[PDB]
Amino acid sequence: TGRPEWIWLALGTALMGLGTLYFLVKGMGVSDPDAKKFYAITTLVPAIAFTMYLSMLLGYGLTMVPFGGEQNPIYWARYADWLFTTPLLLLALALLVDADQGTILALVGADGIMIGTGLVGALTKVYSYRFVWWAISTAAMLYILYVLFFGFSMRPEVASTFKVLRNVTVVLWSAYPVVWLIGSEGAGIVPLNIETLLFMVLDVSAKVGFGLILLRSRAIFG
Template structure:
């Protein structure tokens, strides 16, 4: 099948994935902020895949095509995934901002590398790898520290599952980029499309599905926030 066919597959998969948080928000309105973030992840991805299937944002290069809609998708959805993890762990705002900055540098470096000839390509790639290392450090060390050793076991388990899923799958993207026509050219465009659609589906729809299944952790986060807000009034 052509890459465009796989893009349509991705669009349908992302659209179906969006139904999960929408249904949860209808059934549990108290969770709507969390569900809105999840719906934003798959909803934006579905739109991006439709645009790619229609050829919008496709920039022909020497021997391959750069899908600008894909990078725009990642520029929006990856910070949303980080935001959901931050909503569970509740770090200081500057921590989330720092993670988003690192994330944006990763995506921007990827665009720069895709649009540049060698050796500039590999310089951009190296910058992206360094920024990604900083992002992983924040996800693996900084956010768990904010969660704390005395975190609710259910919140901790849900956070850890989603964080590990994210780190493992995100680490595969630079490898695919390196092997794809954008890098060394080992993968053909059709195979690249298959692999990226699969990774996108698991990293986004899989994340959303696990988050919805573990939504009782959200109730505990909200309950803790309510108790913290009520404490000053109780002390008066």
């Protein structure tokens, strides 16, 4: 279509789709109750992303927000995606270390605050206020990274896989606020097709690569 970023959305659609099917087939036969939690999470995440990538590709998950006296194309469907996939990803890490329920509730809650404020900043028509929402969202992310790092006699397999998955998370999630900031939702320093490209690379690595690393460890089994 006439949207330069269409190619990255089609590509993202394809990659999330293939990853979903891949995890689906791989989870076939799993009977371990613990492993079943990781397969479910690991398959559900790209499955949701696929649908949200498809609605962006078809034009449904897109809206125009006026600001800076311009009509800016905002892909709201990413928040619909993140709203469910990021807490699911956080659950995988938490089941991993057998996190206390209070901690999980804190993470999920901070995460929803994180995505919900980013969405409000994304749709805000007063330019300066967009960055206020961006800051609160960022504060929520730092909270989460903090607990991932400092809130966590576990099996050496568990820790070993956790450290890896936790380093992956901190590095890939921290990039999202930067893309947003430099991208069309914020300062507009990077054009929307490049921004969509960056998010597509982060999403697939945060979702497919994360699940491949996760589904490789024996830490997921009881």
